[PDB]
Amino acid sequence: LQPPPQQLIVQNKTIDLPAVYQLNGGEEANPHAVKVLKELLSGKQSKGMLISIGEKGDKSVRKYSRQIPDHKEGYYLSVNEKEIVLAGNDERGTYYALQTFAQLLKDGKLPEVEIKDYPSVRYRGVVEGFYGTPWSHQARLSQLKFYGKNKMNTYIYGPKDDPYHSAPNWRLPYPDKEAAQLQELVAVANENEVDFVWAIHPGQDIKWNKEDRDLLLAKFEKMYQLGVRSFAVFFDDISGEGTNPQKQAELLNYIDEKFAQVKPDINQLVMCPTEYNKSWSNPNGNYLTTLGDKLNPSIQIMWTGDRVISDITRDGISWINERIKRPAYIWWNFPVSDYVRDHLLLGPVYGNDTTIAKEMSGFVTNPMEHAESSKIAIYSVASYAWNPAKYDTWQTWKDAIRTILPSAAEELECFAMHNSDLGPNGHGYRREESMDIQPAAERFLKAFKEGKNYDKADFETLQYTFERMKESADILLMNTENKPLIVEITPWVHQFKLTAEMGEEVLKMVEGRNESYFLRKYNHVKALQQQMFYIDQTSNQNPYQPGVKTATRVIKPLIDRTFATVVKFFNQKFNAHLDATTDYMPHKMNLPLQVKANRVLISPVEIELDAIYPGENIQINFGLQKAPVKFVRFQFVLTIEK
Ligand SMILES: CC(=O)N[C@H]1CNC[C@@H](O)[C@@H](O)[C@@H]1O
């Protein structure tokens, strides 16, 4: 059961899904839930075993009102030989009773059980709020079904790069095509019991005048016409007047008073502050307390923790709550990769204190621009925020992988386990990676480097890893159970497979039959390096972190260091002069050259390019008018026309 229920009593009897059943509650219970139930009961006829579905207050469930948790979205579920009860505290609770029911049903059989359940955190879900290609319409439809199945009740739509979400075209209604698609998203979210929260991000060019105020209002009104019933205003990552607290609070309160309190059915009204984490707060400034004191009590204030990227702690949530005068609505910046875009972040969700549910009013994950890939952290975040006290890091991760790709779980597992760390970055945030084999890697390399014998067991572990990596890469590429997931990760799967092959060859170079066999392996390895460079230069070419990195934390560094090392030993033994560099680089220059898009740079006297190119400019720190260029004699960046 994911998420795990608050309370669970299991019997060790199993009853069959009644061939003949009698349904009590069908026309009075939440239709979404009745719909799931009926699908599960296809080819089953309606005397028979009584099944009771309904919300508190419904005739159908009166007998059980005591049993139904007195919690929003709570429910009571019961299966025995004589009957089934599915009873929500409210309509969404009945739907969630059904989501739990569906997981219990295995082979037309059910365990005898009694469950009392409800969420420990009121708002749980996802904020699509990253920089990068926003999620496709189809990705989104898929996400909303996934959210319902995992009792996530919130989808906050706010992709930084959607021009009708941010400046300047926030002022503009969506075009007809986009609008109809959003209308469809709201309907699907409704059906899966998710609040679609439409966010707008206007602060960068907002004028604090009636005109802009009205435009914002009319935009919200248009969204309402499309079915939206929840709203947010994001003030993150902007500069200027669009960051004045009082003005923000005033705008928020006005939206509240003239809009959220004027429609009959508006649910969530949420604002993300400009100072959105501790380390970006002006120490002793009045930004957060102004918001805390001026914002109407019913307005949620988002927060990403002590740092831009970070895990939520007891001391952290307390620090913020004292200033905003209410429980923070958490915006957790994981697995979002928009600042390390050459990495996938597919590891477990961990790091967030499990005892602070009461201290947060919401918990949403900012995911990767890779939607299907993000379902691993998303399912885990769903599990954590519904029941943080039973949150199990690795078990949920494995459960997510097996839900996403039952046909190749172990392979996805192998792949995700070695694609979890972010590498070095401006936000300082890291994840463990490849911990299973890290000790063996570390012993092997320390010994080898120092001419001290390595343990044969460690050598074999590595070897075994490279082999499993190749099997999972090839099996992943050809998987058709979730094509969109495979499309998203393919570049990295290729890169991952070449990494595994590079490791095998380098290991063979360590064993090293003879002089000629060594050179064969050494040459194979140069070729692989060049192939990795090629993928890194042709796949995923975005402006910020172009390319494709994989197994960066433990595995690549082990292979590279082992290569440099065995080559040095070969050069010594045979008085040779093999090049021991580990990153193929087609240009020539003691710091490593790098190639990013059409820049050729020295890592922070004479460079020689592998060819003549039109020069664009040189930016040095202590234009070329298209002049031909191959050599450059004297930050250190050459841009050329490529
Ligand atoms: C509140 C917030 O995190 N805003 C920005 C910038 N900080 C983190 C980045 O990952 C972005 O995705 C995010 O949209």
Ligand SMILES: [Ca+2]
């Ligand atoms: Ca009802």
